[PDB]
Symmetry: C2
Subunit: 305 residues, 2 copies
């Protein structure tokens, strides 16, 4: 029934996006109830970015120092504490549109939707994956800082990521809605390239299962391999080690398609060694790894039995 | 040498316009703007009627109470109804409080928009796509996504351009504009109708190359140029849509911003099609993307909402 890289409906998040200003610096903020979230680095200039001592810079500021706006209306800040690398700002009024939500820390390989904003204004939405090296191959052209990543299960919003800095390498880094970074990074203007990335095997597998369940299986073969034997190969081509844990997860998918995980695993091995024949899997000329087995299940198995 | 994601328009505005329509055994989606609920007329059909309904007639059978319209839990009493092409217009006794400033507009082949995929009146995903040359859309529609709409946002105005009517043998999708009139030769019955052969949206590969260039990725540019005719007499051998003078004109803003002239970019693209890319990648990808329009670029690469 055709495939596509879907993202969650951003509506519930949009209603929380606000702008936060300090001096000449302005970025996005997350307004949930009476509290507002934004990168603690909003309180820094071209100066305070080389080697700031946030604790020192925060005492030097007041509630009055923060300009929080709701579209085109100011929200007054009446309190403020710093948690990790994020600022928690108290405001006189609460957000009516605050949805039901949770703050969860995401695992590399997992996926989410990002609502890229500029000046607290929803600009666009897209789905990506937390790269194995904790970065994200996103499009955060200058300004998106403070934007958030999230998942929507039912009517509950799970916030997992907030954009903080535009890495020198070109990819983007951030934290969880708790101020804790995703990766070996810090909100400093120091050079700090990204670690060695890898391909998400689990996701590459779920994808091949999707292609198959989508009536396309020219890559499936006769052979079958063992786990150690698959890694020996996959790890050659820069793929992430596949574990028993990963094979479990691909269980339900293994059912539906009648193909077993090690089998499908044998197929991939063949794709890595024998190239892709110039042929295509789901229109893609390459192997897509930004679809978790869960995502596939939510796109090739409708919304019912 | 940075990041640039294919993004969808924030879905909030359209989310609050999605209702569920139920007319007997069938349950699809409806667009609710002001006091009218739009949806596919084939909602008044069941199993075998779908072979060649005589709607006009079967529409007299139907009664206002026949239509069950729901928005969450609220009951939208339908106090009127009339057909328009392949659309059914249901008058409800309640104007939609969330109705956004909007307009209906027919889209031209190649152009793009966002689709907020729905199920039983509730959103589940949002993605970007393009009206394919053959007049279909490579989307991800499963268990009756009929009634799901395609749109574009401008400032604060939502331009609805697409409504999903049915899946095609191709595993592709066909639908109409908000006036009920179909895209392509398709019809909302059931023959042996299939999509015609697809081609690459040349205009969009070009816009993308401009985007790469503006990104700082220009290894593919070259010292020469070409004639529209020779470019076509080449690209058409690689399955490309013939580039028209009107196309060249649309790239104007972009060729003006980069200093690179359309036929000079064609020259560049011409050679990209004859000697592959030799491992050389563009904007990261290893394949020339054709679903990003000239305006999509002007919109992203230019921090705005």
């Amino acid at each position: 029934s055709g495939f596509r890289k879907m993202a969650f409906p951003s509506g519930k998040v949009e209603g929380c996006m606000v702008q936060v200003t300090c001096g000449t610096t302005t970025l996005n903020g997350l307004w949930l109830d009476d509290t507002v979230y934004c990168p603690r680095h909003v309180i820094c200039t071209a100066e305070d970015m080389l080697n700031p001592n946030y604790e020192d810079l925060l005492i030097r500021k007041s509630n009055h120092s923060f300009l929080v706006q709701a579209g085109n209306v100011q929200l007054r800040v009446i309190g403020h504490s710093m948690q990790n690398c994020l600022l928690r700002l108290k405001v006189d009024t609460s957000n009516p549109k605050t949805p039901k939500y949770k703050f969860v820390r995401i695992q590399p390989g997992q996926t989410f939707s990002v609502l890229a904003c500029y000046n607290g204004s929803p600009s666009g939405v897209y789905q990506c994956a937390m790269r194995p090296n904790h970065t994200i191959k996103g499009s955060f052209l200058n300004g998106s800082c403070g934007s958030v990543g999230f998942n929507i299960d039912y009517d509950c919003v799970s916030f997992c990521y907030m954009h903080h800095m535009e890495l020198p390498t070109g990819v983007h880094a951030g934290t969880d809605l708790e101020g804790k970074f995703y990766g070996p990074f810090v909100d400093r203007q120091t050079a700090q390239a990204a670690g060695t990335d890898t391909t998400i095997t689990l996701n590459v597998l779920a994808w091949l299962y999707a292609a198959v369940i989508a009536g396309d299986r020219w890559f499936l073969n006769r052979f079958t391999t063992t786990l150690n034997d698959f890694n020996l190969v996959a790890m050659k081509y820069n793929y992430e080690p596949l574990t028993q844990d990963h094979v479990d997860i691909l269980g339900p998918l293994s059912a539906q398609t009648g193909i077993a995980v090690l089998d499908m695993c044998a197929a991939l091995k063949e794709l890595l060694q024998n190239g892709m024949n110039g042929r295509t899997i789901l229109g893609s000329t390459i192997l897509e790894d930004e679809f978790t087995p869960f995502d596939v299940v939510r796109q090739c198995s409708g919304v019912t039995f």
